[PDB]
Ligand binder design. Structure first.
Ligand SMILES: O=C(O)C(=O)CC(=O)c1ccccc1
Ligand SMILES: O=C(O)C(=O)CC(=O)c1ccccc1
Ligand SMILES: [Mn+2]
Ligand SMILES: [Mn+2]
Length: 181
């Protein structure tokens, strides 16, 4: 699984997933599934950010935490929007709202609600993608055009196929459920 991750995602994404895991004392060599999940989540964050006009999104995910909060503070004090209790993934200068992005190997609506309750914030938009091509957004708003979202979905499904092809997919779909329970 480890070797698969390093040739599936780019070094920058891998590099940042490693840091993210290390910051919390977790080891990518042992918890290889969570390693893959983090690379995936980052890739989706980046793609999502790229989907818009050039300066539309501030990227909050994939930074050192302290600098992230600083940028969040800047946005809140700048635009009037409420400070969220949990670190979001993006800010949308176009729509004037923070975005949390989810990637589940489980049901889109299940994951959506686990998130929605935890944040407990009306302002933060929520956007969930599955490895099977479904997506769910708050108020049925997807932010991006159909083209952008389709590229994301395609990419996720490619990751699933690539894992399945090597026998790593079952173990990976297992991990999330076990983590939840
Ligand atoms: O699993 C995901 O989708 C994450 O986005 C995970 C993440 O950011 C993280 C950060 C620090 C430690 C462990 C996971
Ligand atoms: O799951 C996700 O989509 C996250 O975006 C998770 C995340 O940011 C995080 C940060 C710190 C600890 C655990 C998860
Ligand atoms: Mn995040
Ligand atoms: Mn997220």
């Amino acid at each position: 699984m480890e070797d698969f991750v390093r040739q599936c995602f780019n070094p920058m994404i891998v590099e940042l997933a490693e840091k993210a895991m290390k910051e919390y004392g977790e080891d990518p060599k042992i918890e290889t599934n969570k390693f893959a999940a983090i690379c995936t989540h980052l890739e989706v964050c980046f793609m999502y950010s790229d989907g818009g006009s050039k300066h539309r999104f501030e990227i909050i995910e994939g930074r050192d935490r302290t600098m992230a909060w600083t940028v969040v503070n800047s946005i809140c004090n700048t635009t009037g929007v409420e400070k969220p209790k949990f670190l979001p993934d993006l800010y949308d200068y176009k729509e004037n709202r923070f975005i949390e992005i989810g990637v589940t190997r489980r049901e889109v609506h299940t994951y959506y609600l686990e998130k929605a309750n935890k944040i407990k914030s009306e302002e933060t938009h929520i956007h969930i993608f599955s490895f099977t091509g479904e997506e769910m957004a708050t108020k049925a708003d997807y932010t991006l055009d159909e083209e952008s979202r389709a590229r994301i979905k395609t990419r996720l499904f490619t990751i699933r196929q690539e894992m399945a092809s090597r026998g790593l997919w079952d173990s990976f779909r297992q991990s999330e459920r076990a983590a939840a329970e």
